[PDB]
Design a protein around this ligand. Sequence first.
Ligand SMILES: *[C@@H]1O[C@H](CO)[C@@H](O[C@@H]2O[C@H](CO)[C@@H](O[C@@H]3O[C@H](CO)[C@@H](O)[C@H](O)[C@@H]3O)[C@H](O)[C@H]2NC(C)=O)[C@H](O)[C@H]1NC(C)=O
Ligand SMILES: *[C@@H]1O[C@H](CO)[C@@H](O[C@@H]2O[C@H](CO)[C@@H](O)[C@H](O)[C@H]2NC(C)=O)[C@H](O)[C@H]1NC(C)=O
Ligand SMILES: *[C@@H]1O[C@H](CO)[C@@H](O[C@@H]2O[C@H](CO)[C@@H](O)[C@H](O)[C@H]2NC(C)=O)[C@H](O)[C@H]1NC(C)=O
Ligand SMILES: *[C@@H]1O[C@H](CO)[C@@H](O)[C@H](O)[C@H]1NC(C)=O
Ligand SMILES: *[C@@H]1O[C@H](CO)[C@@H](O)[C@H](O)[C@H]1NC(C)=O
Ligand SMILES: *[C@@H]1O[C@H](CO)[C@@H](O)[C@H](O)[C@H]1NC(C)=O
Lengths: 106, 49, 173, 173, 173
Amino acid sequence: PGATLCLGHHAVPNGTIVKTITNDQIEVTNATELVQNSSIGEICDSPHQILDGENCTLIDALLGDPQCDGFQNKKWDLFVERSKAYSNCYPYDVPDYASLRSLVAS
Amino acid sequence: CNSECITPNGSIPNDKPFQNVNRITYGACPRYVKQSTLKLATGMRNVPE
Amino acid sequence: GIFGAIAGFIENGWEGMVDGWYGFRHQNSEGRGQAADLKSTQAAIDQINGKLNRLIGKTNEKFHQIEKEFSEVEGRIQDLEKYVEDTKIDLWSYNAELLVALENQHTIDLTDSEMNKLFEKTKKQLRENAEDMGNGCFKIYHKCDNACIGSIRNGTYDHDVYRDEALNNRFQI
Amino acid sequence: GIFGAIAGFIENGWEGMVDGWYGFRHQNSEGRGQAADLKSTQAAIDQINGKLNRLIGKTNEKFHQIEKEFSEVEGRIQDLEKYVEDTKIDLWSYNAELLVALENQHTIDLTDSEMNKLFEKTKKQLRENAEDMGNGCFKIYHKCDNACIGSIRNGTYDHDVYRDEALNNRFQI
Amino acid sequence: GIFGAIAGFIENGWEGMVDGWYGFRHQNSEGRGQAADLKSTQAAIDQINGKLNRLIGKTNEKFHQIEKEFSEVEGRIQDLEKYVEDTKIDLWSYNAELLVALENQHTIDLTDSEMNKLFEKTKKQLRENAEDMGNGCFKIYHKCDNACIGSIRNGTYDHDVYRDEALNNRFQI
Ligand SMILES: *[C@@H]1O[C@H](CO)[C@@H](O[C@@H]2O[C@H](CO)[C@@H](O[C@@H]3O[C@H](CO)[C@@H](O)[C@H](O)[C@@H]3O)[C@H](O)[C@H]2NC(C)=O)[C@H](O)[C@H]1NC(C)=O
Ligand SMILES: *[C@@H]1O[C@H](CO)[C@@H](O[C@@H]2O[C@H](CO)[C@@H](O)[C@H](O)[C@H]2NC(C)=O)[C@H](O)[C@H]1NC(C)=O
Ligand SMILES: *[C@@H]1O[C@H](CO)[C@@H](O[C@@H]2O[C@H](CO)[C@@H](O)[C@H](O)[C@H]2NC(C)=O)[C@H](O)[C@H]1NC(C)=O
Ligand SMILES: *[C@@H]1O[C@H](CO)[C@@H](O)[C@H](O)[C@H]1NC(C)=O
Ligand SMILES: *[C@@H]1O[C@H](CO)[C@@H](O)[C@H](O)[C@H]1NC(C)=O
Ligand SMILES: *[C@@H]1O[C@H](CO)[C@@H](O)[C@H](O)[C@H]1NC(C)=O
């Protein structure tokens, strides 16, 4: 008579393939995604202070284009510029526009 | 809503170490990589019946 | 893979063992049964959770940086900003590729390791009272009911109790 | 190195084995002979080709970049271009050195592993019919002709056939 | 951790062993004693020193670079210099963290490996003259004085000398 005793390990019917050092496709019992591949499509207003530029570039809010009067003296952690923004004051340019914009943003 | 990480596509959860949503980011964000997926094993090799 | 138990001398896993990662199946005079081993399972899980702890929820805060999209052609200064960005992205992309491949080899191997240890601990427990049949199972050369079986699993099996009995059976003619 | 077979209890390799990486040498009443084991050799080869597959023929395309050589002293802007490139070069150079050291460590060990597995598999097959002489060889305690030896290599050896014979020889006085 | 000797079937280390990393404690008819094993100890040290040789005193010379602190707000160019530097710092900081975690895992594991190899070599030497008690110790089933004990340690133990004696003891009723 006597007995038999077997050692073993689990398995699943729905394993997932990952890559390793010696084989690009090996099936394991479970895995997790390390790359975030999607957004919810909106910028959350918390916990950082968001300032929506709407029709105004940073430079335009700075200079004081009338439609940007609401922006006076406001602060932000992140200023958001919209592609729809436009100037509606006296036509202007800024030598090294990008730097001024940058230093103000910061 | 409340989210640490902002990108031009919108805010994203920041649980994962990497992301391929946008190279532009602000806040506590995963680092941008080119891969659309990287699967980390969290179990042993599967050897079915 | 590297220890050669999982996907090795263990022909395959047991899909019906859903309450642990490693365990025992037995056959004796009262029947055949299965029980997960908690300690080995936990050992494997702990190492994997350790990896996750380094990786999950550990992102770095960055704030004002450089611009990364450009609406006008500018030349020298813009090439460098773009080149800086592509270079960074490629290096980060490398570490990640390297990290996962490496983690995964080590994870398959460490889990293989724990199975083997359990095999080894069990093998040692039975002394001269059992023989290795070569596929992860042991033939026990004595009557061994559930209490007996439970004792092996429970790490309280006393080899001395069955030795005379077992030896007579092993070394018969 | 890490399993302790290759450069370990196996004193050395066999230069005369040219049709496989692992194999068997035997001596018996009909003579002494050699045969490669195909499956273990292939297992090792398969793992190494996998590394090569990640590394060989997998280069990245790059096009317009920044300039990297300069005929005039320019200062601030030029310092940065050079520094960007040196920084990049140093990091890629680091990953490669580390990569090779790591890959090489894992390959010797995985190959050591495969040798050990074949030993272990062999050890189990022979059951109580052979003893480990400690240097990777087994003393087989029964008459074992070419067909017998072939059966072990072929994984069809029946320990039950020889057990009585072997036990008498092992446990003589 | 991965071989399962240290912090495994070896319950703990021996603090009173100050002349080696691995060794033997014995008990026999004349008393009980301890001696370090030189070869295994040296093997572990050599591998760790090898790591040290790659890492210590191997710094890279750098000379004129870019400025990294700034007293005036300047915008675009300053943003790029700082970001390049921040980017560089993060990747090097990453490699080091990964390097240390990796080196440390492999070091615990390689040391575990050396202990196990020493166990196995010892296990094999005693042949059928000893049994594995499961906690890294062997019960030797024959009279074995210091010279006998010394022979195992010295790798000169002749198993044939003690076999009849040992076998009678193992397989008593
Ligand atoms: C296969 O493995 C994955 C990963 O091990 C399992 O995912 C687990 O799912 C839960 C629920 O989403 C995770 O909980 C979350 O943890 C994070 C950080 O630890 C926390 O911020 C969240 O609030 C949430 O509680 C959990 O992390 C995760 N497991 C681990 C240890 O990472 C998944 O369940 C497995 N799949 C199957 C079918 O077995
Ligand atoms: C930003 O300016 C745009 C463009 O002038 C505004 O769009 C107008 O919105 C009104 C009210 O709905 C419409 O009647 C007009 O047809 C729109 N004009 C154009 C040219 O599209 C918009 O209202 C402004 N946005 C904000 C939030 O102030
Ligand atoms: C996040 O936004 C970026 C930028 O808009 C998206 O990138 C675009 O992807 C499409 C689809 O292939 C391309 O045709 C465009 O050329 C990309 N635009 C730019 C300016 O790069 C990206 O798809 C978005 N990410 C996610 C995950 O939705
Ligand atoms: C181990 O032995 C003790 C003492 O009999 C018993 O109470 C316990 O249930 C056993 N453990 C398991 C889980 O079998
Ligand atoms: C293994 O042995 C079986 C049984 O005789 C035989 O059919 C087969 O040809 C053998 N395999 C090899 C490759 O020698
Ligand atoms: C090993 O044993 C031999 C035989 O007695 C002895 O002469 C020698 O001193 C030992 N060698 C070492 C290095 O301990």
